[PDB]
Design a protein around this ligand. Structure first.
Ligand code: MG
Length: 430
């Protein structure tokens, strides 16, 4: 990175004299040796420029860091319009978030992108201008000059100042009770209802160190972290894919239905068997397959829903049914608007569930249960923003949700959302 800063500089001096004073984009790819292990997260955390986005594939074999926004997008829709004016760079990637409401996003064209696939990495610098590439070359130089060498990343040393649930247990029970009562009206089939837990600390929270702690313990999860700026962040470790797209081949999953994990393998496996056989959870999952299959009918070709599998995580396990289809169009706005929010996350029918949530949830989910990842012309991948946290100075808001369906027992659902909140909370309160 010392060497690559140097190589980037050397490159930039030359370009800033040669490149034309015309609008456009250059993409500069430099191989990034992983001869020596490089901790991208703790590197990113060293930097003083914003915004910053961290993302790791759930399989752990794809990892990215982006630093600085050439452009900011308020929706995936806006980002795709931009990509489509640049068909010549089909692998140009925009990175970041969709909020719970999929029509609002915070996505970036990264100034600097470190991306790893496997045991191999690339540093990409991009130059973009509306007026002059020559111009943006000099901004690029100043950006580089901003770079700071890697410092070690401290573990969290946090003193809890304040705690509050929205809703609390008492309020949760009446809510779940209300929700089941409403489902018993025969029109609403399912609603997913969540709790925000505001945690205040004696000091500001290092979101990057929170992210690292989660990557260390929350295995088999996608990790996403956006630093909006130095005081504000959204991150999490989610087991769930919204979609992945390679040209036209589309992958999604119905992931819904939960039991506790146990550290002991047999017990975990037996608990998973209980889940597979459980009517209530079966139905909780089947309602997602129904929603997803319907939502995708008009815009896709032959659909394959696989049999349910149990997916095992640090504190929780889930039923999961992969889904494969082909899009009619290679279009990420069709993917996001058809899919998000699925009945795993909002409910069914979509309208009645969205309305119930708008009416009775004592907080706005904002980034919670949206989506995180990247799109480019050729491929994209987003996860669902579950198992996630919004950090505001010294407050961490934790989110957890439970799908409500006929037969939901409030006390069991409280226990569910606690097990979900725990994957992140236990990192903050040792
Ligand atoms: Mg559940």
């Amino acid at each position: 990175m010392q060497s690559l800063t140097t190589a980037l500089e050397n490159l930039l001096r030359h370009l800033s004299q040669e490149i034309p004073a015309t609008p456009g984009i250059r993409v500069i790819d430099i191989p990034f040796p992983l001869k020596d292990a490089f901790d991208a997260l703790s590197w990113l955390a060293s930097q003083q420029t914003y915004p910053q986005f961290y993302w790791q594939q759930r399989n752990g074999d794809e990892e990215a860091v982006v630093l600085g926004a050439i452009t900011r997008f308020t929706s995936l829709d806006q980002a795709q319009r931009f990509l489509r004016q640049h068909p010549e760079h089909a692998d140009l990637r925009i990175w970041g978030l969709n909020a719970f409401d999929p029509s609002q996003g915070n996505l970036l064209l990264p100034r600097l992108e470190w991306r790893r696939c496997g045991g191999k990495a690339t540093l990409r610098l991009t130059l973009f201008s509306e007026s002059s590439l020559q111009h943006d070359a000099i901004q690029a130089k100043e950006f580089i000059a901003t770079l700071v060498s890697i410092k070690p990343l401290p573990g969290l040393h946090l003193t809890t100042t304040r705690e509050q649930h929205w809703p609390d247990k008492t309020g949760w029970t009446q809510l779940i009770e209300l929700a089941t009562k409403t489902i018993a009206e025969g029109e609403l089939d399912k609603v997913v209802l969540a709790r925000a837990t505001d945690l205040h600390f004696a000091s500001p929270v290092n979101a990057a160190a929170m992210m690292a702690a989660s990557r260390r313990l929350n295995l088999n999860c996608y990790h996403f972290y956006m630093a909006f700026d130095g005081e504000n962040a959204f991150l999490g470790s989610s087991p769930e894919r919204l979609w992945r797209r390679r040209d036209k081949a589309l992958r999604t999953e119905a992931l819904a239905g939960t039991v506790a994990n146990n550290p002991d393998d047999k017990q975990a496996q037996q608990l998973g068997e209980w889940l597979m056989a459980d009517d209530k959870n079966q139905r909780e999952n089947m309602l997602v397959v129904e929603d997803i299959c319907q939502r995708l009918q008009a815009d896709t070709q032959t659909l394959d829903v696989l049999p349910p599998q149990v997916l095992r995580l640090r504190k929780v396990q889930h039923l999961r049914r992969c889904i494969w289809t082909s899009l009619n169009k290679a279009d990420d706005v069709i993917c996001l608007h058809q899919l998000q929010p699925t009945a795993a996350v909002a409910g069914l029918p979509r309208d009645l569930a969205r309305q119930f949530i708008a009416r009775h949830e004592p907080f706005t989910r904002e980034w919670y249960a949206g989506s995180a990842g990247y799109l480019s012309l050729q491929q994209s991948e987003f996860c669902v923003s579950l198992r996630s946290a919004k950090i505001s100075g010294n407050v961490v808001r934790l989110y957890a949700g439970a799908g409500i369906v006929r037969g939901s027992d409030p006390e069991q659902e409280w226990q569910e959302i606690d097990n979900k909140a725990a994957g992140l909370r236990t990192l903050l309160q040792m």
